[PDB]
Amino acid sequence: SMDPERRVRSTLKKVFGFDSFKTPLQESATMAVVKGNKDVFVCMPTGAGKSLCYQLPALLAKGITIVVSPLIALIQDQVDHLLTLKVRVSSLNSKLSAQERKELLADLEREKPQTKILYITPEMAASSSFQPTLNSLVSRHLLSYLVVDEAHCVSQWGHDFRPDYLRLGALRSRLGHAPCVALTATATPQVQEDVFAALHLKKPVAIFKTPCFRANLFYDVQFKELISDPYGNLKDFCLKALGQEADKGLSGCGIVYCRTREACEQLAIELSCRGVNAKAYHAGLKASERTLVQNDWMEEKVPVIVATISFGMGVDKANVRFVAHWNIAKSMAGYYQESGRAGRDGKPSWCRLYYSRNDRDQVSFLIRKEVAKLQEKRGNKASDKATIMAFDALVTFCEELGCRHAAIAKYFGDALPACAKGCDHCQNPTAVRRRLEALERSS
Amino acid sequence: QVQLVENGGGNVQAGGSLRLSCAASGSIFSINRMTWYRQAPGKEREWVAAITSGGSTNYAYSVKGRFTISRDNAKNTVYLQMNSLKPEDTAVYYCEAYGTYTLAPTGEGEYDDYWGQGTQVTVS
Ligand SMILES: [Zn+2]
Numbered sequence: 001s002m003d004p005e006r007r008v009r010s011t012l013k014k015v016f017g018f019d020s021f022k023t024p025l026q027e028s029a030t031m032a033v034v035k036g037n038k039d040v041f042v043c044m045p046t047g048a049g050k051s052l053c054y055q056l057p058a059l060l061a062k063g064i065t066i067v068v069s070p071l072i073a074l075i076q077d078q079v080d081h082l083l084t085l086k087v088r089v090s091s092l093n094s095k096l097s098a099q100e101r102k103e104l105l106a107d108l109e110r111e112k113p114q115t116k117i118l119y120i121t122p123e124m125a126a127s128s129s130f131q132p133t134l135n136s137l138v139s140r141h142l143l144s145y146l147v148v149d150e151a152h153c154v155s156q157w158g159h160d161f162r163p164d165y166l167r168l169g170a171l172r173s174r175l176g177h178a179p180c181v182a183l184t185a186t187a188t189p190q191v192q193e194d195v196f197a198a199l200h201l202k203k204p205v206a207i208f209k210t211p212c213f214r215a216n217l218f219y220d221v222q223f224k225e226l227i228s229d230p231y232g233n234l235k236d237f238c239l240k241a242l243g244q245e246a247d248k249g250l251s252g253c254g255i256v257y258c259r260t261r262e263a264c265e266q267l268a269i270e271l272s273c274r275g276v277n278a279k280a281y282h283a284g285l286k287a288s289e290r291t292l293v294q295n296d297w298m299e300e301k302v303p304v305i306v307a308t309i310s311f312g313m314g315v316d317k318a319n320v321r322f323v324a325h326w327n328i329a330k331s332m333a334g335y336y337q338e339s340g341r342a343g344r345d346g347k348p349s350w351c352r353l354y355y356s357r358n359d360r361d362q363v364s365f366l367i368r369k370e371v372a373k374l375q376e377k378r379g380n381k382a383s384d385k386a387t388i389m390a391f392d393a394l395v396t397f398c399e400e401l402g403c404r405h406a407a408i409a410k411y412f413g414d415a416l417p418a419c420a421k422g423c424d425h426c427q428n429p430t431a432v433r434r435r436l437e438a439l440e441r442s443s
Numbered sequence: 444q445v446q447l448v449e450n451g452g453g454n455v456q457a458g459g460s461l462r463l464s465c466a467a468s469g470s471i472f473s474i475n476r477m478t479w480y481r482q483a484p485g486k487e488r489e490w491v492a493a494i495t496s497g498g499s500t501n502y503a504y505s506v507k508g509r510f511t512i513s514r515d516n517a518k519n520t521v522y523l524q525m526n527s528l529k530p531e532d533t534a535v536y537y538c539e540a541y542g543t544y545t546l547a548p549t550g551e552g553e554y555d556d557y558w559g560q561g562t563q564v565t566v567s
Pocket of ligand 1: 421
């Protein structure tokens with residue numbers, strides 16, 4: 001094609017069936033992989049089109065794109081999708097018939113193989129029965145790209161450490177000609193640096209990292225210990241949030257996250273009695289009550305659901321005007337995911353964490369118990385340190401003064417976000433200072 | 444990309460001190476390691492001192508006890524205090540900002556190594 005972008009748009013349309021890219025960022029990433037002069041790191045949430053960023057460029061390349069993916073279930077999802085698009089995609093694994101195995105190995109030995117995209121477990125990629133095939137592919141210069149999917153699996157500080165992933169670096173170096181595309185949904189900066197080092201990515205690494213920052217979310221922290229009427233404070237909070245078309249009255253809905261079922265039940269009643277209708281949602285309820293509560297919340301019959309973290313996964317509601325954490329979350333990640341259910345329609349929403357040192361001490365305690373249980377059962381691990389530090393970053397978020405968006409950015413590894421008087425601290429630095437000084441005196 | 448500018452070079456009597464600075468500018472989230480190298484003309488480049496983000500420091504055996512590397516992350520700037528200067532310390536001193544993570548609010552960034560032009564240290 002006269003224009004490389006025109007061929008990319010063409011293939012995205014003709015093969016994959018999309019008129020545009022989901023985001024400028026997915027576009028930029030895909031284009032950097034096509035240009036092929038840089039190793040590429042892509043860190044985008046599950047559903048943000050990571051796959052395409054290597055799958056489309058794989059099709060516009062001379063040769064084969066090997067895609068290392070950690071477990072067979074994940075491979076199969078994409079193989080089947082790619083087969084619906086009549087893409088020449090193969091998978092080498094031991095969940096196969098020994099016949100299919102040799103049919104493919106033969107196809108890979110051909111000068112001009114049928115296979116365009118080869119999905120493979122890291123186990124398979126390091127196994128000696130595959131080494132000959134790998135070598136002839138390397139020798140013939142028949143690899144266009146090496147792709148390492150679920151790249152965080154290389155990090156002991158990530159959530160899913162796989163020793164198998166430690167070997168992928170040696171492999172990467174052998175494929176000098178083929179650029180490496182490493183992808184994950186979840187990487188703190190420390191996991192990023194492990195991905196960059198442990199996979200021997202060639203600097204300069206092009207990074208495409210979906211930021212946390214949403215311009216329409218107002219984050220604040222309130223100290224339960226500093227409030228005479230906590231339930232009253234929450235009620236005013238929910239009402240202000242829902243009362244953003246004064247003429248029409250209550251519009252939108254909200255979520256209030258609590259650690260325990262007991263708390264969900266009681267807090268729902270306390271709010272209802274104080275003039276904001278609310279219902280509890282938690283896994284203790286019968287399946288049918290959950291679907292009635294969710295439904296009532298979804299239909300805006302009851303505007304406020306008070307739930308455990310068991311609520312939100314399977315829900316698309318775009319006019320959540322507020323998420324309030326009544327108890328601090330297990331982790332900054334949790335808090336981000338939960339608070340972030342607010343404001344999906346882009347209109348102003350409010351995320352408020354109700355911090356108490358008592359909650360903090362209780363969650364800190366329960367994290368140290370469940371780590372101990374794991375340390376007894378499957379022995380000591382560096383991920384336990386990351387779990388504790390995951391809580392700590394949220395404790396820190398509550399107990400320090402600074403832009404709240406900035407603190408979430410620091411933790412996930414985003415740039416300083418354009419918080420436009422969009423958090424308590426940026427809107428009134430002194431007010432937050434006062435509350436922290438005041439919380440100091442409480443002990 | 445990143446500008447690494449060195450400062451604080453000079454001509455100084457043996458036994459005297461210098462303080463070199465080294466400031467990275469750009470959309471810097473983090474620097475894995477900042478290392479001071481020195482290069483006398485027609486000699487092999489030499490490792491002087493390093494500091495990780497984390498504040499772990501390491502010195503060449505030749506300068507241990509005489510030089511201190513320090514940093515101000517607020518300014519992505521590392522300092523090399525050089526005391527008891529010897530003529531053997533005469534060289535061009537330069538920085539490596541190794542594992543430099545840059546990032547725009549758009550989510551587009553880089554991981555790369557960056558290098559200073561250097562600063563002249565002569566010890567009579
Ligand atoms: Zn702010």
